[PDB]
Amino acid sequence: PTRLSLEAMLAERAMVARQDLAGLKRKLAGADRVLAPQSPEQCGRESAQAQARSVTSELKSAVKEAQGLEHQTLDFLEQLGEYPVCGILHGDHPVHPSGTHNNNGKVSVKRQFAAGVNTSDALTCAFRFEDSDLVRETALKTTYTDGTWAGFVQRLKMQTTRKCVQEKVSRKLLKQLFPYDPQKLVDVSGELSELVLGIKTNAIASAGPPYWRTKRDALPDMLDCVLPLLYDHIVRKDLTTLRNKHPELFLAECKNKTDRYEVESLGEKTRPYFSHPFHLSALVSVLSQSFSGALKIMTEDSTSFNAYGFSWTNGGAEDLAIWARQAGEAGKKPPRIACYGDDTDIYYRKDGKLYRICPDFKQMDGSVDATTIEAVVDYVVDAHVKQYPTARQFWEEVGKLWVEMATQSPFLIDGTKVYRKMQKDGLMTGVVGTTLFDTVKSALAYNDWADQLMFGSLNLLEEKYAIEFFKNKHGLVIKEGTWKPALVNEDPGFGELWTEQKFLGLQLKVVRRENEKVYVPNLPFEDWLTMWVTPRSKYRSKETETMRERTLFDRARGLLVTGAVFDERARGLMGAVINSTAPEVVCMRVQEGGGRGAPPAYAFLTRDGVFEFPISDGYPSYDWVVSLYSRDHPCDMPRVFPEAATLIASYRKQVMDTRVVI
Amino acid sequence: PTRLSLEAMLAERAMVARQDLAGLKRKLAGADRVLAPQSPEQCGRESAQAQARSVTSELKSAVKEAQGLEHQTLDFLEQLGEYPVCGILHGDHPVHPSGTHNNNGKVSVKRQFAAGVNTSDALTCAFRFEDSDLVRETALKTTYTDGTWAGFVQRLKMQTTRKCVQEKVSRKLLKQLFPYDPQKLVDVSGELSELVLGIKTNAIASAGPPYWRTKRDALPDMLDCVLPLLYDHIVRKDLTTLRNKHPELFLAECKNKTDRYEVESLGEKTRPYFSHPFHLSALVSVLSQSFSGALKIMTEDSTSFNAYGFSWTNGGAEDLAIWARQAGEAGKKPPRIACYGDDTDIYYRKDGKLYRICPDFKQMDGSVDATTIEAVVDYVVDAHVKQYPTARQFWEEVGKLWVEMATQSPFLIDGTKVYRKMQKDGLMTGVVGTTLFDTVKSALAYNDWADQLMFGSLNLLEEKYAIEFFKNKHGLVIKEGTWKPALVNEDPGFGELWTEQKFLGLQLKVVRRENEKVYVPNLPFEDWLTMWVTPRSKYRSKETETMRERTLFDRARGLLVTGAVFDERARGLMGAVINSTAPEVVCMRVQEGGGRGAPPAYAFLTRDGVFEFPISDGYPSYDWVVSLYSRDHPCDMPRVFPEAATLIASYRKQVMDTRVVIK
Numbered sequence A: 001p002t003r004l005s006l007e008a009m010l011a012e013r014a015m016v017a018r019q020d021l022a023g024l025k026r027k028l029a030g031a032d033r034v035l036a037p038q039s040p041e042q043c044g045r046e047s048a049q050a051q052a053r054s055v056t057s058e059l060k061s062a063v064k065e066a067q068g069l070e071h072q073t074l075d076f077l078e079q080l081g082e083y084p085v086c087g088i089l090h091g092d093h094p095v096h097p098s099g100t101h102n103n104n105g106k107v108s109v110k111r112q113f114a115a116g117v118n119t120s121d122a123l124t125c126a127f128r129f130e131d132s133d134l135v136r137e138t139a140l141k142t143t144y145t146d147g148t149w150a151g152f153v154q155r156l157k158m159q160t161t162r163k164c165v166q167e168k169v170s171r172k173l174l175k176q177l178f179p180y181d182p183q184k185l186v187d188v189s190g191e192l193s194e195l196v197l198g199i200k201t202n203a204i205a206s207a208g209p210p211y212w213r214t215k216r217d218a219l220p221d222m223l224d225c226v227l228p229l230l231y232d233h234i235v236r237k238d239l240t241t242l243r244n245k246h247p248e249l250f251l252a253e254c255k256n257k258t259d260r261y262e263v264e265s266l267g268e269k270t271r272p273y274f275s276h277p278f279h280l281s282a283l284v285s286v287l288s289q290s291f292s293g294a295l296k297i298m299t300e301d302s303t304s305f306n307a308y309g310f311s312w313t314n315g316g317a318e319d320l321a322i323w324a325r326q327a328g329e330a331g332k333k334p335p336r337i338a339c340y341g342d343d344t345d346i347y348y349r350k351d352g353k354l355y356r357i358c359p360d361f362k363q364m365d366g367s368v369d370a371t372t373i374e375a376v377v378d379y380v381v382d383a384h385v386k387q388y389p390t391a392r393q394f395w396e397e398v399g400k401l402w403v404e405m406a407t408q409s410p411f412l413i414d415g416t417k418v419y420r421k422m423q424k425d426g427l428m429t430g431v432v433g434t435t436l437f438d439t440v441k442s443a444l445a446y447n448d449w450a451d452q453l454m455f456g457s458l459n460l461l462e463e464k465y466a467i468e469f470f471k472n473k474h475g476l477v478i479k480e481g482t483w484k485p486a487l488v489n490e491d492p493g494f495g496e497l498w499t500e501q502k503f504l505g506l507q508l509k510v511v512r513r514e515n516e517k518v519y520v521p522n523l524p525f526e527d528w529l530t531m532w533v534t535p536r537s538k539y540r541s542k543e544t545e546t547m548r549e550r551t552l553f554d555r556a557r558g559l560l561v562t563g564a565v566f567d568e569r570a571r572g573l574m575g576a577v578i579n580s581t582a583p584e585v586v587c588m589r590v591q592e593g594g595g596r597g598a599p600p601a602y603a604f605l606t607r608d609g610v611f612e613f614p615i616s617d618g619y620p621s622y623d624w625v626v627s628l629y630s631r632d633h634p635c636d637m638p639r640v641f642p643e644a645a646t647l648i649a650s651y652r653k654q655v656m657d658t659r660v661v662i
Numbered sequence B: 001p002t003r004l005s006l007e008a009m010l011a012e013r014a015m016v017a018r019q020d021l022a023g024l025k026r027k028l029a030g031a032d033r034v035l036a037p038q039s040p041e042q043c044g045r046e047s048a049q050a051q052a053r054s055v056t057s058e059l060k061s062a063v064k065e066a067q068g069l070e071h072q073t074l075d076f077l078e079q080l081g082e083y084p085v086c087g088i089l090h091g092d093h094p095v096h097p098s099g100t101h102n103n104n105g106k107v108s109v110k111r112q113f114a115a116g117v118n119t120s121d122a123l124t125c126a127f128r129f130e131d132s133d134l135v136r137e138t139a140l141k142t143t144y145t146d147g148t149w150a151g152f153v154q155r156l157k158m159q160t161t162r163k164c165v166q167e168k169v170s171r172k173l174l175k176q177l178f179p180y181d182p183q184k185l186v187d188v189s190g191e192l193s194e195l196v197l198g199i200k201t202n203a204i205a206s207a208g209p210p211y212w213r214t215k216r217d218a219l220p221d222m223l224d225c226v227l228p229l230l231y232d233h234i235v236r237k238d239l240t241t242l243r244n245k246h247p248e249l250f251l252a253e254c255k256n257k258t259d260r261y262e263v264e265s266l267g268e269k270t271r272p273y274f275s276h277p278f279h280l281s282a283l284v285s286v287l288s289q290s291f292s293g294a295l296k297i298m299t300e301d302s303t304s305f306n307a308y309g310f311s312w313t314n315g316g317a318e319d320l321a322i323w324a325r326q327a328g329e330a331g332k333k334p335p336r337i338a339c340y341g342d343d344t345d346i347y348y349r350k351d352g353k354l355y356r357i358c359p360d361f362k363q364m365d366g367s368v369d370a371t372t373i374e375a376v377v378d379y380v381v382d383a384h385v386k387q388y389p390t391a392r393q394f395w396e397e398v399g400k401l402w403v404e405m406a407t408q409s410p411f412l413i414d415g416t417k418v419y420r421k422m423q424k425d426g427l428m429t430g431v432v433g434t435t436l437f438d439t440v441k442s443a444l445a446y447n448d449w450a451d452q453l454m455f456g457s458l459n460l461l462e463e464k465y466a467i468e469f470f471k472n473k474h475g476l477v478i479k480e481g482t483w484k485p486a487l488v489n490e491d492p493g494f495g496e497l498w499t500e501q502k503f504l505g506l507q508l509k510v511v512r513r514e515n516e517k518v519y520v521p522n523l524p525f526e527d528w529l530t531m532w533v534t535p536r537s538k539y540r541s542k543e544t545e546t547m548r549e550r551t552l553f554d555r556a557r558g559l560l561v562t563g564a565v566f567d568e569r570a571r572g573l574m575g576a577v578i579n580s581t582a583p584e585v586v587c588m589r590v591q592e593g594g595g596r597g598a599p600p601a602y603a604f605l606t607r608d609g610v611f612e613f614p615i616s617d618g619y620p621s622y623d624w625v626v627s628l629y630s631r632d633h634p635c636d637m638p639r640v641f642p643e644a645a646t647l648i649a650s651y652r653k654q655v656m657d658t659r660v661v662i663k
């Protein structure tokens, strides 16, 4: 009687079983568990939480004080009038949801500066498996918060009133610094709906005005209502009429970015970003995302300054080293320069010796000139149009909107007053293409820096003159103390570092796989600990104690994969967290990661950004994590409970050989 | 940002949308619907419902009375004692559940003859769109019931006490009549757990004793405890010890089969079958299923008598015709004989003209001799051992268990008394390989029938001498009136039939597609109508009104695919049901068919029985069904609501050309 195989029955049985924790607990009672390397227990649960709770209160006290500070006035921004709420309807309901973002018919919004900080669950784990003096110091240094009004306004002022230097950039120069594969460019000559449906974005992210919902809840309304309307006005050159009738259709929202902030500067620093209308962002994302997918990176073309698209896993970390060594003698041969937004990696040789530099830009978004922004939008639009000339007219018009969004969009801050930057200079952070805009601006400066080296200006290898140079000739602010070129260990031994410097937030280290060197990311334990005790997520009301224990497990796997596994103390910490996780929590059915578990928070592991754990009940072992960064990857992810898929099915392994003699 | 494409978001949005009937009805309020050809409404909703209940009540009354009849005694079966309940444990529970099949320590089981019949749902639809006199007359003829104590004991006695004729069969003849492909044989040389986990079965089916639960709920106990225990006593040749300590591990249960039955013969016909212990049936299923997966069929090898594995779709119906035409002159050239269980199709030529014969056996299981059973088991075991000799002894030991289960396997009927068939002859229906055993028995007989035609015995073409032949030489009972050779239409025109005869329960018919001929299955409206108004499912109170209405939709698609679409009246009745189905029910999310919808009941559409609909919200059109039975590229299944996927996600696509000139 055929229907469903026995193996399928067991599988179907297990899937049902791991949805019942209480039952899952009994099924894994005496199950052979594989413990991961962990740190020894330092104190009990009670003390660990009490100490962790004490730190959190002291952090809220600091945040509370800073948030009480008076903030500067917004008289540095052009003040437009008040915008009326969009009366557009999508059949039965209005595109602008009634009862939200409305003040007597005028569009409104309210900035959120909460006192709440973190969950402190991860902090309890730290106090439990590490020295307290070290844990408390690290925890009190940084915190996850909404920031402060004072820091928000001050930071907004800085990136909207800075004197910029217009760049001398041409298509010839951009084709040289940022080469791409025309064949990888998306066919923009196709129908618009298909193109837009192809762009990727965060479903939870705000749709901006006039939707005031998630991009998921507002997707339909913008797709067969707002988009069509926008399109018809674009082709008829009648954008101005649509702007006057529905001002909110082009309104942006200036927001304070909740993030990890230094506690001793919460009152003078809170990064602002701009959230544009879904239909505008999604439309340009057709070009922006198309172009990034065609862009060659530093390790694919040694003439390219582009690091935007670089990833560590799959030999990627080794690629950096192999490419970095191509650096020539300062003054005689060209250096190696990789640009990834505000982040940059510089290599040069002095007397044959390889040196590395990892400078920081002090809020370079306020240094991005309109000439560079507009020259990039042209480079992108011209690239597509040069490939599919049948649609030149339309996308050139889109480039105009793209430039407006990046520099001169009207936005709300707090309340009902609408604002706008006095000057076109300065990049409005958050706009589609922010990473590219920063990269090109950064690359053009360093490309100039390289040219000066050839004249023999080897004094530009020094912080003093470097800082002076980037400020006068490019208007970029190199943070003092970040220009410290270090001698590079070109052939690291087992366990040795490339340099103690960072790129994309990580160090380059060499480890032993099996008689072979593997290049992998690494960080000091203090840095791993800082990220751990400072999860980017505030206390949610309905997050049960179970889903909370699972978050520790998933965050622990993530950090290990990012490189925490290559540090002793950090490895042990995540190891202690994983081993202290209940069996039913390790083998439960999770939703994140397509059921395979939430992926690492780090965004530069794979170029497509998509990292997926093999199984949800597996722990990151040293041999498995190394295989992610090696060019081979001949390794499966080990299970915390070997022989668990059977136990969940209420049966156990048993070999019954049919070859036996009777 | 970048988490997932917008196209993906609409997909997720569409997924949750098809899980809310209220919202789903709302979105599909004024959507465009492609209506299937239907019969006009014959009478109102209340009137159709009134006539339906009245009929089902008659059928209940008929079944209730038939169940009150007295049945014969079980004196014809060997009288064994009582078996003790198996007190084997798994950890937190015993293999034999507490307070279930137990009577003061002794194994027990009660036979179920309830007076529940049908549901009246499909029948109400029939009265609504069809002739009252026809629907009434058709529905009153048969019902889906448990049967009766009388017909159950009668049919059991007949198949357990018939005088059989031992077949002269050898491995040589079996290779000649049943050729297979050694490469397609499962490597039973490596491990048992992996092999046993390879066999497929019904999860809702009883695991038998001592589990007394569904195979799904007893699987863990069977695999992790009982099976390993059985293995040890097999390798040590100590099965006689395990029998005398845990008799229930070898005990079977004789059950009455709930099914469609003729009402006027409820007291005479209720087919019995045997359900062996899970660990046994699964163990032998390894060899059985492996062999049928490697078996050649008539249309793949002319010398083969095998029809076990034949399917209709994908040119199957035309394959049968192309194979049948090869039949030679009776006496001179060999005929064309295909055997599938007790069902058999025969073709021969008399003065050039082709004739077809579709005879019926009377409970063939009672006629299956023990020698044929042994010969078949040895044939299957030898085939696997010839391929993988490194495990010969083990599976040969299994062949011993296989033969036992098919003949001398002890069993319970009702109460607590253990019975057994006194003779090794007669096949215990239900045993793994029942289809194969019947097929081989039928082939050995017809193969001999074929040889007699060569000896000049052309009188065996006549029913009078055919019946006498199968009886005297093979103990096979040909049901009188079923041996009636019909002149075959070798090249049927558009809309014409192969013959009015049935094979595998369907007729062979030729239909038109543009200009080419297509061979497809077919039945009279009366036969489609009988299957429709007689669903093989009893009334279940824990089944909502939405579930019932969805089932009408599914069964309507299933019959159309099976061939109801090629009958004008049947096509119209099924179309009426589909069109009368609520949009929220059509585009609803279903669980059956892996989310694609419940597959057709007919299990001879494809070789592996699995027919999967492309979509759950589509309807079987004439064009789509025909492409299923043809050999080339089945068309896309037409959606009931062509604008469905869009309207669900609250989306309406609008062409925006990027290649447009700007003002």
Ligand SMILES: [Lu+3]
Pocket (backbone or CB within 6 Å): A131, A132, A133, A134
């Ligand atoms: Lu200390």
Ligand SMILES: [Lu+3]
Pocket (backbone or CB within 6 Å): B131, B133
């Ligand atoms: Lu009439």
